[PDB]
Design a protein around this ligand. Structure first.
Ligand SMILES: O=C(O)c1ncccc1S
Ligand SMILES: [Cl-]
Ligand SMILES: [Mn+2]
Ligand SMILES: [Mn+2]
Ligand code: NA
Length: 610
């Protein structure tokens, strides 16, 4: 070198550039050159590092300690920066069609592509000098149990201590990961809040962000994730959606596995027999509630493996093995109660970071639907830091908690070979037409059932399509994703799990729920379990198998109207098939696989014979 080269050794405040794997050092030093951080901190993952970082954020006004609990914290954000922004989330590939199908008549709802050239301009308009005056933290992290053959490693560079703390909870991170990685391949994750010092614009609520320039980008062919201007959740904790669904789904396709928006639970019947099930419901639905269910049926146990993302690969015996690539739960707070989710309420009482919830005057947390009366003189500060009376919490407010703290965490939740999935459940909120539960007729049918998923949006009401619960998350062309799932039927040895669809939301003509739900949903899981064992507990219908009369355990429920709850109307299903047809034709178009068109035609045909 003729001067100091591009050596940032002088600016390292923890760790050593010399001890990094060569390619990790290149990634760090290149981005230090580009972003111009004041310091580089190579994270170790230690409790001391974590404790110190939290104390520091506290000193800078960035988080508040919640004094009601053991080591819990609260962040309140700039209200411009509160959620994933789909319209600023993009995937870059040489060809648009590889990322999203070319729709027939409308705009695609299945992803957003950006050209390499357009992304380069965007990147150049954002990242140069963006970390000036700030520490660049280097977060080495594993998605999956450390050293599992199903795990994948990333390195996230960030200028946000809040991301570092949250990534500690949500991933495995620190020195052990760098040691596991060695000279292997990793996903390159670059994040900045986009507020270099000295600040050009007002800092709101001690929450650095750059809303106008917010851009969450994915470069699967480069194995890169590049995210600018949001400090929040799925935009900044790059392991979760960006890596573990978007990038990972593309890797899965290359490699023969599946990366999916599914909870994983273990269910044990009164005789001690255990199965694992995976379930995909829209983000707005109760995946966490199901994954941590407290079953009402005596002798049944539910244990949680994960509440969000599943990586699944057929092993050499044909079993579908699943891991939770996450290390925590990043759960939507509102609606979490002792009634809807007692085990979640337990988990979050220790060592948890909350974002955009309300705070009680006794240093506790609160939100819509917490269903917990407040003591005599206890008042509320809203998530906007103002006094509040009976929203107090933002609808996308969150808890971020260690998975190991769940009182019903599955004993195998970190087993490196994964847990054997025997059923895959799809579901959506449908106030009419759709039965409580049905079973797919075949693998191909089951893939169609995934494809056809629809759900009532939270509020007049709209019923939206959300195939496989993956609509915001596909890493590549959804047609090709469907072909990938279909291909599993031709894999030698593969034991294809049974596929089900559920709906907890069916209403009578007065708008009253026909099914009580919550822990009563264990009655549906019981039926599934028996069907997997080969029990003759099903009746054939045009849409699939439903429970026979008297097959569902209704003991304890009184008079459940199973007649209406399992009613199938020709008129409803005629309309439903037409809406699914028009949707797949438009959105998937030339990339719709033959077998999915065949399943659509077959369902139309069975409905025609009613
Ligand atoms: O809330 C519902 O009723 C529901 N049921 C099944 C699957 C997803 C949801 S959101
Ligand atoms: Cl989010
Ligand atoms: Mn999710
Ligand atoms: Mn086939
Ligand atoms: Na704040």
């Amino acid at each position: 070198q003729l001067h100091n080269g591009l050596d940032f050794s002088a600016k390292v405040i923890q760790g050593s550039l010399d001890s990094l794997p060569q390619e990790v050092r290149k990634f760090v030093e290149g981005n230090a050159q580009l972003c111009q951080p004041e310091y580089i901190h190579i994270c170790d993952g230690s409790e001391e590092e974590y404790g110190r970082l939290l104390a520091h954020m506290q000193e800078e006004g960035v988080i508040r300690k919640l004094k009601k609990y053991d080591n819990c914290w609260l962040a309140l954000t700039d209200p411009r920066d509160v959620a994933r922004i789909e319209s600023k989330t993009v995937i870059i590939t040489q060809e648009q069609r590889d990322t999203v199908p070319i729709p027939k008549s409308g705009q695609s709802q299945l992803g957003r592509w950006m050209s390499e050239e357009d992304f380069e301009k965007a990147f150049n308009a954002r990242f140069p000098g963006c970390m000036k005056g700030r520490t660049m933290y280097v977060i080495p992290f594993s998605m999956g149990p450390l050293g599992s053959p199903l795990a994948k490693i990333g390195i996230e560079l960030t200028d946000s201590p809040y991301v570092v703390a949250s990534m500690r909870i949500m991933t495995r991170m620190g020195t052990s990961v760098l040691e596991a990685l060695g000279d292997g391949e990793f996903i390159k994750c670059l994040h900045s809040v986009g507020c270099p010092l000295p600040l050009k614009k007002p800092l709101v609520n001690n929450w650095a962000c750059n809303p106008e320039l917010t851009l969450i980008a994915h470069l699967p062919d480069r194995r890169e994730i590049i995210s600018f201007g949001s400090g929040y959740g799925g935009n900044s904790l790059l392991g979760k959606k960006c890596f573990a669904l978007r990038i990972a789904s593309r890797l899965a396709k290359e490699e023969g596995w599946l990366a999916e928006h599914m909870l994983i639970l273990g269910i044990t019947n009164p005789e001690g027999k255990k199965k694992y099930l995976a379930a995909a419901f829209p983000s707005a639905c109760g995946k966490t509630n199901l994954a941590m269910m407290n079953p009402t049926l005596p002798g049944w146990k539910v244990e949680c493996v994960g509440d969000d993302i599943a990586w699944m690969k057929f092993d050499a015996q044909g079993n579908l093995r699943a891991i939770n690539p996450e290390n925590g739960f990043f759960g939507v707070a509102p609606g979490t109660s002792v009634k809807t989710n007692p085990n979640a309420i337990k988990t979050i009482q220790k060592n948890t970071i909350f974002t955009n919830v309300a705070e009680t005057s006794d240093g506790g947390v609160y939100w819509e639907g917490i269903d917990e009366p407040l003591a005599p003189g206890v008042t509320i500060t809203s998530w906007k830091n103002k006094e509040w009376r009976p929203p107090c919490a933002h609808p996308n407010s969150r808890f971020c908690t260690p998975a190991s703290q769940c009182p019903i965490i599955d004993p195998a939740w970190e087993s490196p070979e994964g847990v054997p999935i025997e059923g895959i459940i799809f579901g959506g909120r449908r106030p009419a037409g759709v039965p409580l539960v049905y079973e797919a007729l075949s693998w191909q049918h089951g893939v169609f059932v995934g494809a056809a998923m629809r759900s009532e949006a939270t509020a007049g009401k709209v019923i939206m399509h959300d195939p496989f619960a993956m609509r915001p998350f596909f890493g590549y062309n959804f047609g090709k994703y469907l072909a990938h799932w279909l291909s599993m039927a031709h894999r030698p040895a593969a034991k294809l799990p049974k596929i089900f669809h559920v709906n907890w939301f069916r209403k009578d003509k007065n708008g009253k729920f026909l099914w009580p739900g919550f822990g009563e949903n264990s009655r549906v899981l019981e039926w599934m379990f028996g069907r997997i064992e080969g029990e003759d507990s099903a009746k054939l219908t045009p849409i699939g198998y439903v429970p026979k009369e008297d097959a569902l355990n209704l003991k304890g429920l009184g008079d459940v109207n199973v007649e209406e709850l399992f009613g199938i109307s020709k008129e409803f299903w005629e309309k439903e098939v037409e809406e699914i047809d028009k949707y797949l034709e438009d959105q998937v178009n030339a990339d719709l696989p033959y077998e999915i068109e065949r399943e659509l035609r077959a369902l139309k045909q069975r409905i025609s014979q009613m």
